[PDB]
Amino acid sequence: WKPPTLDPSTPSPIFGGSTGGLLRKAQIEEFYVITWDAKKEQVFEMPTGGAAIMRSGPNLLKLARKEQCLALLTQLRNKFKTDGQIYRVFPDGEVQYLHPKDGVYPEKVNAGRTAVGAKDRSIGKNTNPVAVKFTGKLGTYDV
Amino acid sequence: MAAAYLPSVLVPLVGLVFPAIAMASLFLYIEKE
Amino acid sequence: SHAVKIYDTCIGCTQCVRACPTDVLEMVPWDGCKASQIASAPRTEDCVGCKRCESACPTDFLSVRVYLGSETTRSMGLAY
Amino acid sequence: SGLTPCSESKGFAKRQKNEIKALTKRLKQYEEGSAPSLALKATIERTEKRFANYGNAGLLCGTDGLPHLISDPGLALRFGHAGETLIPTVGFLYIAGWIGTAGRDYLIASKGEAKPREKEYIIDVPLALKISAQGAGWPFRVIRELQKGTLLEKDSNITVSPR
Amino acid sequence: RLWCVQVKVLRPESYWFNEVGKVVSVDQSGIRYPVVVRFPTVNYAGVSTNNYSLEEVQEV
Amino acid sequence: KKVKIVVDGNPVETSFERWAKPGHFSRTLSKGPSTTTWIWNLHADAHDFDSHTSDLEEISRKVFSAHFGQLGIILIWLSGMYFHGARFSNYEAWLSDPIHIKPSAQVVWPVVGQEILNGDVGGGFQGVQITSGFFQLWRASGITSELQLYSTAIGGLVLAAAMFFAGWFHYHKAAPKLEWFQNVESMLNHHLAGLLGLGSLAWAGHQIHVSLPINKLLDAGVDPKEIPLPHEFILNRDLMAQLYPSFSKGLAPFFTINWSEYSDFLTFQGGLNPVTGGLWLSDQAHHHLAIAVLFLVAGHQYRTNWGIGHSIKEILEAHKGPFTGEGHKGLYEILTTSWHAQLAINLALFGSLSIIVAHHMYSMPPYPYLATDYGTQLSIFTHHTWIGGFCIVGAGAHAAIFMVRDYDPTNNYNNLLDRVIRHRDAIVSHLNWVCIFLGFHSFGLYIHNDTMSALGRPQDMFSDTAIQLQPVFAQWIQNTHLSAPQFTAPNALAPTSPVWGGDVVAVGGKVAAMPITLGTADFMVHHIHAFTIHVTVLILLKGVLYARSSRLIPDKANLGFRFPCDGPGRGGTCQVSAWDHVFLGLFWMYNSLSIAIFHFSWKMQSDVWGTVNSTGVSHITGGNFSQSANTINGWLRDFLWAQSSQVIQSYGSALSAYGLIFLGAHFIWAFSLMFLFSGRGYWQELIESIVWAHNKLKVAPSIQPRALSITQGRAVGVAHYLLGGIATTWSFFLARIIAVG
Amino acid sequence: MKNFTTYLSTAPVVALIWFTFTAGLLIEINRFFPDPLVFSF
Amino acid sequence: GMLETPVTSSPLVAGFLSNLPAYRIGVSPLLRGVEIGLVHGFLVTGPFIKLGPLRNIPGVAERAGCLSGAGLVVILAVALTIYGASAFQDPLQTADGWQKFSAGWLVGGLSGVAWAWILTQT
Ligand SMILES: CC1=C(C/C=C(\C)CCC[C@H](C)CCC[C@H](C)CCCC(C)C)C(=O)c2ccccc2C1=O
Ligand code: SF4
């Protein structure tokens, strides 16, 4: 499996526009792009408010937050049974592929993933905050 | 009171001139990168 | 960014991963539980801190813990 | 406390006279034998009986002409004020122990059933009436359970938070 | 350790610390918390079961 | 296609089996409690029929039978009101002397000293003075004896039992199907022509044949026992023609279209009856006849079974324009499938109607001796204002519930609902700016006046004797309505109300109605009203528009209508739900309506109500509204501090219950702040310690004690806040206006 | 009749009956023995 | 994406906005500040003259109102100056451009205050 590339010529869903879309943060900080392949032309609910018509075939939607893209992807997976891909786009043009990160959805266990944030103890075995004073650590969970 | 002109100078200074300079300088300080 | 830690009481029920609205969590292979999988938090820079994962966790006490830390644009959930 | 008995207090008698005078002033606008006249006359009779009973009870009155209660069990016993606080204390403590013991017995009886939570919102009324009648003899059973050590759960069997 | 045997929970952060539950099953594949215990009361999440290690449960 | 009766026979067995199973209606709650949260959840979810089942037919049947139950309860309440008038009242004595006798229909039992509340209301009677206005309503209907009140009480209880029977019958025996409920064209035709139209016609018949001659004899000075009974006027036409000579001509002028012969009892006088201070009953009879004809015409608009008539779907789909996309398309499907959208519309209009009723009943008092009963006038204005505000907040709530639960984007593409959602940010931002501007330029005027008065500069104030803010538009409207009988309504003898101008209507030496002049203080308080209404609208509309999503939480519809938060993340998301917007809108509606009723009370006590002596009119507070209502200090001193003297010195009199309720309502309002200012984590930990104490003595309950949920904590806080504040104002108002009125 | 008596045994109905009995007992005691302030006869 | 309306996307609206000194095609930022300051500083003296604490004293009212307007202009010039030092750490959206804009605002505002005083005196 390889990470897909973003095609910026992908058509957008039929939408009349809304006041809930992108702002200055998209131009100067980052924005997000969700792409999916619709089986048929149908009406879906925008995460920013209102009803849009997704076109048959590939679709491309630009959204301000990753949470908006994942809410739309949850709607697409649960209601329309459609998979999707989420990218992060930077103002310099760099595109970072986000979801699903290794091609498998994160709820399904996949080989080649490494545990990060794992602690080899139960939560009641954390030390006392007096033990991490003047150490620079975030807290007893950081040691 | 002695030097009765002093409230007419110091009250505008402490009440208007000093807070304006203080907020301007603190705003420039908290916005500094 | 917020800190998300997974403790070894995790039973690999995948509920925290399904509850996450910003794709912070995933299941990796493991051997410490019957389901042979544990939750992991590789993308805590996208964690908003909603603690939906802790609401979804069935273990007592929680196996997934979210510690709110320094706030960024992503963690404050800002679209502007 | 420097108080005077209400039977010889001038403020007490003045208050009785003023209350009777106000009720009689209200009384003169109605004809005799009418319902408001009878109601006001009954109120006047109740006022007179109440002031007489408070004077006869040995209540102590302040400078305001109002009865003051004595709650120290020493001063109440050696000066005849035990009916103000001490005997009501004994009566309340008996009834409160009755209610608490009846509730405890009902909870303990419902603990042994197959659905212990069911009896807490759908009351076993015959069982509650039987347990409620048995709460009269609460001090004997409670003091025996205290001596036997069965009144208290052991500390090892009670959940606590980490310290 | 047996089946349907009363055990006392010794995990301090558990909701059922110092409380008695019934053993549902004990896993034999060497997992970290193999003892499955059913409790008559729910915790704050409405859950009635939890997994404990061998040292976290004492037979009563 | 065809409008017809369709029911299902015996759908639900009539049995007590589910009465013994609390929570039976809910899939989650039927399993029984584990914690104490189940106790509250059972009452909170009891009437959420759409949560119990997704079948619209079962929901509709439940709603229909619940409405029958509510009608039965209302009829029980009304029959009790008529019974207490018949049995425990001084209504006949008040009929003989309606000026010097205070109405009373509640008598307390003599026990624990509470018989002091049976005050000397007059008429050889002792009881609690009532402010509901039933006596004036009964006098206007022509009721002259306790026997007629007894008959209405018995007949009301029979109809109450018929309503409870119909609710049982139409749920357990013959429950109508879904297509019966969706006949909105037939429902509108029947409720306009048959309910409102025939109701107005029947009441016009009662007014003409009973209310007009009995009240004419009452105002002529005839003793009520010597007045003939209403059926004597029905049977003897000559007795009717003695008072109204057109009755000698019979029904011939009606059928020969000589309607002007009926001008003696079908009038257009306008104004008030000088004897009673109420509206002319002949005017009301003509009003109800005209309203009946208009509603009978209005009820023939919609097509049911005979081809002619309008289809509401066609009207909605035809009304679209260039700015509005698909227009009203899809609204018929919304309003025939969502009970919550219908409840939102109907609650908004019903609440607005209640407030309009309050204003029109004070300004044009329609009952004899209502206007000079200042307690009744203040009470009914305040009551109907509060009912209106609560219904409008409920309209916002159920609009939000529709948006969360019943909204479908597939059926709403580029229609009005979709386009409103698509510019919700513009709407909310513009409304926010309007609210900020209104708050500044209304409340800051008061702050400016308070600062100027406190700085010893009354010439720099906003007042009539200073910088003036004259409400010139309202003054022009008042002058136009005063001059209406001259040109724009020449057949009206008088203006609709004395409040527009003209003379003082006095009944028994007291002002019934008089001109209400508007100055700078009226301008300021009216813009305060505009500001508070706009903020309440902002909260409720923001809750409706962002109920499904926002930039903060994009999947808010999946969390539901009523949820506490989405966690401490994104900076903190407490109270994002539309329910919490209803929760805040309740406070703001309370603030708005409190200012409205304070404005009413002070303005009528200062400029309308009072005693008419030989020299002129001496008002209750002596015209101090125009002098001091332009400052916050003026309000706090001259209204709040001055007018609360009656409720704080009411002890030892019949009004002492108002002093007790004043104190207890302050307590209840303060008690609410512990729920509002705190959170359930503290209470759960405190409950853990208390549970430890109960576990030590083996008295820990099996139903595990939990602190209230976050939403329940908010609901309890706002409920106790509203109850405490409203009952504080209630006791203050009633004690003040009964003692000084 | 069993289901009806089970409904009457639910907590709010039992509370209504018990508090009606207790309130009535207190009311009738204060009616038969008006103004009791002290335990004196 | 972005909602467009006749208020936002008219030829007449875009024509009116383009002729404003903040949006004109080629104008130095000092001159844009000069026109903006002239227009604003002329306007602000009106409320100060007609509603100030000395509004009922003839002669002193206009002078006090114009001095108040000049003080407001000076305060807003300070606010513009400290805005530019923070926001910049289109020639208008630069540090030097905003410095020239602030200087032009101050000059134009004082000129507008003086012109309002002259007009009230004539
Ligand atoms: C005080 C408080 C509590 C504690 C209040 C609780 C737990 C409610 C207690 C209500 C009653 C009194 C509990 C017992 C109810 C029984 C049915 C009564 C039986 C007693 C007999 C006499 C009838 C909260 O839980 C809370 C939660 C969220 C925000 C604020 C608050 C808050 O302010
Ligand atoms: S404080 Fe309460 S309401 Fe706010 S985010 Fe935390 S849990 Fe939710």
Q: Is H40 annotated as a binding residue?
A: yes
Give the pair of three-digit tokens for residue C77: 């959930």
Query: Is the minimum CB–CB distance between D160 and chain E shorter than 8 Å?
Result: yes
Neighbour tally for F503: CB within 10 Å = 12
Cβ-defined contact of A115 to C28 (cutoff 8 Å) = yes
Chain C interface with F: residues with Cβ < 8 Å: 2, 21, 47-52, 55, 66, 68, 71, 75-77, 79-80
Q: Show residues of chain F in contact with E41, CB under 8 Å.
A: 34, 704
What does each C-alpha distance from D34 to D47, D80, F117, F146, G9 come to in angstroms?
20, 43, 18, 19, 46
3-state secondary structure of F570: coil
DSSP state of F598: H
CB F740 within 8 A of CB F601: no
How far apart CA E46 and CA F61 sit, in angstroms, is: 34
User: Distance (Å) from the C-alpha of residue F558 to the closest C-alpha of chain C?
Assistant: 12
Chains E and C touch (3+ CB pairs under 8 A): yes
Nearest to residue F702, comparing CAs of E20, G7, D112, E10?
D112
Q: Is the CB of F39 under 6 A from ligand 2?
A: no
Query: Is the minimum CB–CB distance between A77 and chain C shorter than 8 Å?
Result: no
> How far apart are the CA of D95 and the centre of ligand 2, in A?
43
Annotated resolution, angstroms: 2.1
3-state secondary structure of C5: strand
CB F713 within 8 A of CB F675: yes
Name the residue in chain D with its Cα closest to that of G3.
D122
Q: Show residues of chain D in contact with G21, CB under 8 Å.
A: none
Strands A118-119 and C3-7, how do they pair? Answer: parallel
Tokens 């008061």 belong to which residue?
A: F446
Instruction: Name the method of structure determination.
Output: cryo-EM
Write down which chains contact chain D via at least 3 CB pairs under 8 A.
Answer: E, F, G
How far apart CA D154 and CA E4 sit, in angstroms, is: 24
How far apart CA H16 and CA A16 sit, in angstroms, is: 26
What does each C-alpha distance from D51 to D100, F312, G31, G40, H100 come to in angstroms?
37, 77, 17, 13, 92
How far apart CA D65 and CA F145 sit, in angstroms, is: 49
Cβ contacts of D22-29, under 8 Å, gap ≥ 24 = D23/D47, D26/F120, D29/F120
Q: Which residues, in sequence order, are CB contacts of F24 under 8 Å at separation 6+?
A: F18, F30
Q: Which residues, in sequence order, are CB contacts of F712 under 8 Å at separation 6+?
A: F40, F44
- The kind and range of the H/E element at D140 are helix D138-148
> How far apart are the CA of F594 and the centre of ligand 1, in A?
29
Q: Is the CB of F559 under 6 A from ligand 2?
A: no
How far apart CA F298 and CA F292 sit, in angstroms, is: 10
DSSP state of F228: P
> How far apart are the CA of C48 and the centre of ligand 2, in A?
14
Q: Ligand 2: which residue has its CA nearest to atom 4?
A: F574
How far apart CA E50 and CA E38 sit, in angstroms, is: 7
* Chain F stretch 453-472, residues whose beta carbon is closer than 8 A to a beta carbon of chain H: 457, 459-460, 467
Cβ-defined contact of F570 to C77 (cutoff 8 Å) = yes
User: Distance (Å) from the C-alpha of residue F406 to the closest C-alpha of chain H?
Assistant: 26
CB H33 within 8 A of CB H108: yes
Name the residue in chain E with its Cα closest to that of D156.
E18
Tokens 């065809």 belong to which residue?
A: F2
Write down which chains contact chain C via at least 3 CB pairs under 8 A.
Answer: A, E, F
Cβ-defined contact of A122 to E12 (cutoff 8 Å) = no
How far apart CA H73 and CA H108 sit, in angstroms, is: 9
How far apart CA D68 and CA D75 sit, in angstroms, is: 13
Nearest to residue F77, comparing CAs of F153, F176, F174, F162?
F153
Chain C interface with E: residues with Cβ < 8 Å: 8-9, 11, 31-34, 55, 57-61
Tokens 């399993």 belong to which residue?
A: F31
CB A119 within 8 A of CB C7: yes
> How far apart are the CA of F706 and the centre of ligand 1, in A?
9
CB F127 within 8 A of CB F106: yes
In terms of Cβ atoms closer than 10 Å to its own Cβ (0-12, 13-18, 19+), residue A75 is: buried
CB F705 within 8 A of CB F36: yes
How far apart CA F315 and CA F243 sit, in angstroms, is: 50
Query: Is the minimum CB–CB distance between G27 and chain F shorter than 8 Å?
Result: yes
How far apart CA F280 and CA F138 sit, in angstroms, is: 16
Give the pair of three-digit tokens for residue F252: 């011939």
Helix and strand counts by DSSP (H, E) for chain G? 2, 0
> How far apart are the CA of F43 and the centre of ligand 1, in A?
15
What does each C-alpha distance from E39 to C15, D114, D154, E48, F690 come to in angstroms?
22, 15, 19, 5, 21
Query: F79-113: string of b/e by CB count within 10 Å (b at 16+)?
Result: bebbbbbbebbbbbbbbeebeebbbbbebbebeee
